[PDB]
Amino acid sequence: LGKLQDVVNQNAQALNTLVKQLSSNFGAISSVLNDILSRLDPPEAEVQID
Amino acid sequence: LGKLQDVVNQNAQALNTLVKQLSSNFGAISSVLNDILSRLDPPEAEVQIDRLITGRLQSLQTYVTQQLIRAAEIRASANLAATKMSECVLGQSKRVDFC
Amino acid sequence: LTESNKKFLPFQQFGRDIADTTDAVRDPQTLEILDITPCSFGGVSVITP
Amino acid sequence: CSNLLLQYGSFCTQLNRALTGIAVEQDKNTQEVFAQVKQIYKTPPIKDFGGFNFSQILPDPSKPSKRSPIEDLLFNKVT
Amino acid sequence: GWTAGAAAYYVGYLQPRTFLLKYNENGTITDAVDCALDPLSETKCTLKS
Amino acid sequence: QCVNLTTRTQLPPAYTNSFTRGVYYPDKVFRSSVLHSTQDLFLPFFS
Numbered sequence: 007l008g009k010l011q012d013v014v015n016q017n018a019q020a021l022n023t024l025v026k027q028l029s030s031n032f033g034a035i036s037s038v039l040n041d042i043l044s045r046l047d048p049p050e051a052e053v054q055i056d
Numbered sequence: 057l058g059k060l061q062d063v064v065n066q067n068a069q070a071l072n073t074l075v076k077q078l079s080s081n082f083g084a085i086s087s088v089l090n091d092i093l094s095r096l097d098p099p100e101a102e103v104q105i106d107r108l109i110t111g112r113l114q115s116l117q118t119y120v121t122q123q124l125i126r127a128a129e130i131r132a133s134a135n136l137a138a139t140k141m142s143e144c145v146l147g148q149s150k151r152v153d154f155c
Numbered sequence: 156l157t158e159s160n161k162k163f164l165p166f167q168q169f170g171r172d173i174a175d176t177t178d179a180v181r182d183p184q185t186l187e188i189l190d191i192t193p194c195s196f197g198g199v200s201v202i203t204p
Numbered sequence: 205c206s207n208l209l210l211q212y213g214s215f216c217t218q219l220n221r222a223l224t225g226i227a228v229e230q231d232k233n234t235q236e237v238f239a240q241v242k243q244i245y246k247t248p249p250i251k252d253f254g255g256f257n258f259s260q261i262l263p264d265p266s267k268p269s270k271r272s273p274i275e276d277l278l279f280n281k282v283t
Numbered sequence: 284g285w286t287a288g289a290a291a292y293y294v295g296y297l298q299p300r301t302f303l304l305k306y307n308e309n310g311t312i313t314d315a316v317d318c319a320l321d322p323l324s325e326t327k328c329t330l331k332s
Numbered sequence: 333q334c335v336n337l338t339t340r341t342q343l344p345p346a347y348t349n350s351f352t353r354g355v356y357y358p359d360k361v362f363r364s365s366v367l368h369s370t371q372d373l374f375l376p377f378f379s
């Protein structure tokens with residue numbers, strides 16, 4: 007079946023892309039904010055979290 | 057023919073708007089990245105390049121959103137045309153004021 | 156650089172289009188108008204049985 | 205620029221997927237409108253319909269194009 | 284006592300304004316329409332036609 | 333060297349109206365069938 011399969015595959019792949027979006031640096035020096043929080047002082051940390 | 061001319065003009069004007077958006081600075085000191093690459097070293101020019109990237113990405117996202125809305129409208133019109141083709145052309149439709 | 160068939164007025168150097176892209180230039184030696192065209196681009200597509 | 209787009213490659217993948225879906229959507233849209241019959245029929249050589257003049261909507265073999273004069277006029281009307 | 288024949292000259296002052304210029308196939312200016320002179324001119328120059 | 337003139341009867345300056353005058357090429361580029369708008373110093377029409 008074609009019509010019943012795309013409506014599930016597109017949603018699953020969009021959810022996979024949403025999950026993968028957390029693995030990107032987004033122009034920063036790290037992906038997870040906890041590394042900056044445990045490594046940087048709060049004035050420099052808040053810029054990376056922003 | 058109004059509808060075809062309007063949709064063609066809308067697509068062409070959106071494409072030209074994207075082209076002219078490529079010629080924008082988005083608050084930076086220049087539009088083209090080659091000028092800033094030649095005039096400023098990359099260790100000091102990453103912020104302006106990132107701002108240009110963000111502006112072009114926003115332009116691309118808006119273009120994709122408008123194209124998706126236009127494609128949905130075109131699909132609705134095509135479905136209406138297909139139903140009319142199946143009913144009024146491929147037989148006689150008893151639906152008054154439909155064909 | 157393609158040999159164009161359009162002449163230029165004798166006070167201009169460059170030439171642009173509707174999209175503000177410089178696609179026409181004049182050689183500064185013996186007055187030849189040469190077009191500017193992007194080289195080549197595209198995408199490889201795979202047909203699988 | 206590509207080195208910095210490595211962080212936005214997922215967004216570019218989403219836009220490319222949306223554009224490919226739009227292209228295949230417009231490709232599929234013609235099939236349910238015009239491809240309704242899987243057999244190509246033809247008109248008789250002698251046009252005797254009792255008085256109904258069908259030459260305007262029927263294609264004319266005088267021109268190299270298969271378009272009817274009404275459809276050719278429609279083609280010339282819209283840019 | 285002197286003579287100078289017949290002559291006349293005009294002097295004008297330029298100010299910054301926005302003008303929409305029409306170009307032909309030869310690349311020569313034919314007509315110009317303002318944007319802060321007439322509402323019809325503003326409508327013409329805003330539509331780029 | 334120069335000499336000075338003498339006081340005589342002159343005519344006061346008058347004012348006339350321009351009619352689509354004072355238009356020049358604003359750039360050294362070529363545009364064909366292009367309706368292009370630029371910000372440059374021109375002479376206003378009917379001024």
Ligand SMILES: *[C@@H]1O[C@H](CO)[C@@H](O[C@@H]2O[C@H](CO)[C@@H](O)[C@H](O)[C@H]2NC(C)=O)[C@H](O)[C@H]1NC(C)=O
Binds near residue numbers: 258259260
């Ligand atoms: C059907 O209508 C067409 C109109 O397009 C008729 O074609 C015209 O016929 C007249 C009569 O000889 C000519 O003077 C015109 O030049 C024709 N026009 C074109 C565009 O061909 C045609 O004769 C009609 N047929 C019938 C059977 O009535």
Ligand SMILES: *[C@@H]1O[C@H](CO)[C@@H](O)[C@H](O)[C@H]1NC(C)=O
Binds near residue numbers: 183184185
């Ligand atoms: C410039 O000099 C060269 C060499 O003499 C000549 O071939 C060319 O025509 C000249 N260009 C001019 C005069 O515009």
Ligand SMILES: *[C@@H]1O[C@H](CO)[C@@H](O)[C@H](O)[C@H]1NC(C)=O
Binds near residue numbers: 308309
């Ligand atoms: C300007 O272009 C027109 C359009 O073909 C042509 O008839 C005319 O001869 C051209 N004039 C010059 C000076 O090239």
